[PDB]
């Protein structure tokens, strides 16, 4: 029904690519992309539970949290050392979840020509598997 507290690798179902903080960069504005599996810290996301049912995601060691500065269609998911966006992670199929912020679903954008693309908010076309680290 819900994702329990723990640390996970987060794999997009449609592309088999993993949620990835670009270059493990801890600076604000660093895009959260989907990338080939590495299992490194910038692909390990700590899931923090909140009493209202929402979730927050933070990278191990880097300590940059999933953050969206402007919650509107097309807004980009980034990593931020101090700011975080409260997310709604809802089950769609057994073992497959959607992630949304402010009612807008996360859309996985596969890399193009070797350059990763930030996850964006759509106006569920992207599902995610939460694999325990």
């Amino acid at each position: 029904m819900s994702i329990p507290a723990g640390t996970y690798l987060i794999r997009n179902v449609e592309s088999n690519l993993y949620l990835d903080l670009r270059g493990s960069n801890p600076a604000p504005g660093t895009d959260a992309i989907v990338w080939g599996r590495t299992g490194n810290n910038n692909q390990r996301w700590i899931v923090t539970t909140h009493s209202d049912g929402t979730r927050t995601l933070e990278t191990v060691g880097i300590n940059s949290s999933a953050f969206i500065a402007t919650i509107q269609p097309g807004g980009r998911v980034t990593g931020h050392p101090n700011n975080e966006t409260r997310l709604t992670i809802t089950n769609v199929n057994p073992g497959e979840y959607s992630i949304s912020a402010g009612g807008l679903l996360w859309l996985a954008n596969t890399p193009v020509g070797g350059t990763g693309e930030a996850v964006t908010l759509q106006a569920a076309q992207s599902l995610w598997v939460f694999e325990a680290v």
Copy 2:
């Protein structure tokens, strides 16, 4: 040593004014000011504990969290429906705490001429008392 989980009114020691979400406005960018005591929801802050020792503050009913878009000297504390800034709430004297974001201490700005002023980050001149609601 630390502020435990709970809902609090947060009174600035130096001015006896309370942390207040301006006009109870739930929109992003709404300033967090200090204001005369009302005890209404925009002055009731839920303190959420995190395993790393940080804290996050959310208004009751309004559900806007304490959020700082740019963590630099002079940056303003606002309320945001979906975003939140992880804070460090440290004891200074018995019953008196400092609040900081990204290592920068919160500075209480008393209202001027009837207009509230947003709490800002200084480069501890502002202490806070956490009163259980």
Copy 3:
């Protein structure tokens, strides 16, 4: 709605004086008074929660708990190293609570002539309290 577990300074709203174990004396029969703010151990009260909603208060380091040997109108609140009274801490206004024992509300008595006076129980809410996290 309720006071969560923690350690608090407890200030009387009507007088801005703090719940205070007189002279920090750990002996039985030591009055719990209201006194000027100090922030010392005899003004730090550990709030212990009970499953029925009641609360118990104990001073930090001194380890003397709020205690009422005779729960009747006029009875005095003291500190006791081994005995304690289960209290009902009820919200009256946002951020302002009343304290009662056996259904009798705590009454704050301000000092007279530089001498503190014990909190007492009023007959069957003239005193309210602010719980300030230590």
Copy 4:
């Protein structure tokens, strides 16, 4: 030590149980040892405290174990609002002692068919049986 829970508390030396005399909820009611009944006045809720101490309260009656005068010879009673912080220390596997203010509880068997209140000594072990 004894974990949080509700127990029947039987004295080892007598096989008699901690008993709030007559299920009387008023202050001053003696805490005695009595033949087993299993009723509410023999069901003691053990509450844990972070300093390691314990407090006991009867089920439904809501009278807690209380010692007004914590000196040798003082009597254990039940009180609807007041309670005494106790130390319940393991002596043998499955057998515990109870003390208030460093003074051990002493189980007093009935004299002439009438119950006698537990007293503090300046000798009595207890088995905590989960209700």
Copy 5:
């Protein structure tokens, strides 16, 4: 039901205690009822499960209560890796029954001085004494 904790488990009808025969940690070791010792092979850790069931494990020996064949007459044993999910239901205040697969545990008193393994019946109550 029985809360989580470590207990000595005494059969009411015999006053004998649940006992891992000879403290033997190997599979197939009988779970018997035996005279009180208080040793590790009589200390049972009660683990709670969200469905209401319970599992028992001996302290230090780490052998859990296990029933290979859950049918009338099946024997209760200790096993280092396998365990049987049990239902421990209150019958009277302070007295519990134990069952596996809907079949009650039956305490078997020693025959000729030798312990007899607990068996499942198609009659035995237990007191959980906190260690």
Copy 6:
């Protein structure tokens, strides 16, 4: 480092097949196999944590737990309605774990001729598993 309490689909890395209670049969002696992903109840394993670090697995709704009647090399993993084996679930790589009973690692056996084969214990880590939250 460890698998937290929850309900998981458990996929074998080397074959991308999922731990599967054959035919969802709740009877004792029913093999635990690896099978094509379905997401059904017989592929949903509740992970119960134990204070010593061990773990137990139980199918949702069917209520049959992972069980090894004979813990030896070659012994088969089954589902059992009332008996269960305490397991050691150890991290090998990030996101990839091994499962073992009595110190013997679980070995995934892929189906042959459209017939599933039971997970077995290898002699004293050829099989790894991904725990996917349901």
